[PDB]
Write a protein that binds this DNA or RNA. Structure first.
Lengths: 142, 107
DNA sequence: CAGAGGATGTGGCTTC
DNA sequence: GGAAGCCACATCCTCT
């Protein structure tokens, strides 16, 4: 709980054996996170053990992520620039599922962890027609 | 209303009056911006962005590379090519179009 | 500069 | 009626 480099950096998962970085409540998609996401193991987990992260909710059973896989080293799995590509839906957040590939595998969850959007946290605000006609129709399509 | 860059360029390229600063090279859907600054000026004026220049307009074109709309012609300064199917979108073969616009082969 | 692409902010528009 | 989403750039930067 207080075995992290800094204050309030880690949070508990639905599992008593793991802890992970606190994620921004809302972020922009495909944008690097403010902090390096980590998954800390309380129990003994060998160096090299893989750890993956999957994001999802009612909108996206599973959301496209980038760098969602890291290797455990010294009880800690440090993801390098984990990113969220898939969005979570208006007013919705993703739950993260952390799978630590020990044998047998161990699953840890971080519910309502983060909302992903395109902007992210933002500051408050016969007959034949011609080209011109064809281009105009094409410019409206959407 | 809303206008995308490739559509703007396409407007200019179908207007004989613009052939002095932007024109078709003669090879399919390839085109050249003979006066980049002028094109950027009009683009800026269309989108209402006074500080618009070619340096920035070109960034927009580079965004199309991946979306298969416009590709750059290697080695030819200010030369790009529409790589989407303009024939289906406009109903004219590169020639028919070139004709109506009185296009003269470029090299 | 010209020119590939990443990182972010900006404005018009649309949708719960 | 709007805050919250989407989209398509606009801006800025890096190097030779």
């Amino acid at each position: 709980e207080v075995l992290a480099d800094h204050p309030g950096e880690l949070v508990r998962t639905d599992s008593p054996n793991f802890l992970c970085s606190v994620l921004p409540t809302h972020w922009r998609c495909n944008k690097t996170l403010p902090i390096a996401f980590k998954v800390v193991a309380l129990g003994d987990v060998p160096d090299g053990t893989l750890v993956t992260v999957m994001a999802g909710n009612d909108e996206n059973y599973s959301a496209e992520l980038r760098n969602a896989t890291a290797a455990m080293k010294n009880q800690v799995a440090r993801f390098n620039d984990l990113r969220f590509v898939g969005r979570s839906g208006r007013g919705k957040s993703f739950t993260l599922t952390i799978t630590v590939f020990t044998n047998p595998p161990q699953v840890a969850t971080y519910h309502r962890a983060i909302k992903i959007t395109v902007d992210g946290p933002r500051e408050p605000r016969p007959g034949s027609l011609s080209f011109s006609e064809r281009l105009s129709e094409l410019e409206q399509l959407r | 209303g809303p206008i995308q860059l490739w559509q703007f360029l396409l407007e200019l390229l179908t207007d004989k009056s613009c052939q002095s600063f932007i024109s078709w090279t003669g090879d399919g859907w390839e085109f050249k911006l003979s006066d980049p600054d002028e094109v950027a000026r009009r683009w800026g004026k269309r989108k209402n962005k006074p500080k618009m220049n070619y340096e920035k307009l070109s960034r927009g074109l580079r965004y199309y590379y991946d979306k298969n709309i416009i590709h750059k012609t290697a080695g030819k300064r200010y030369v790009y090519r529409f790589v989407c199917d303009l024939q289906s979108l406009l109903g004219y073969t590169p020639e028919e179009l070139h004709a109506m616009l009185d296009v003269k082969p470029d090299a």
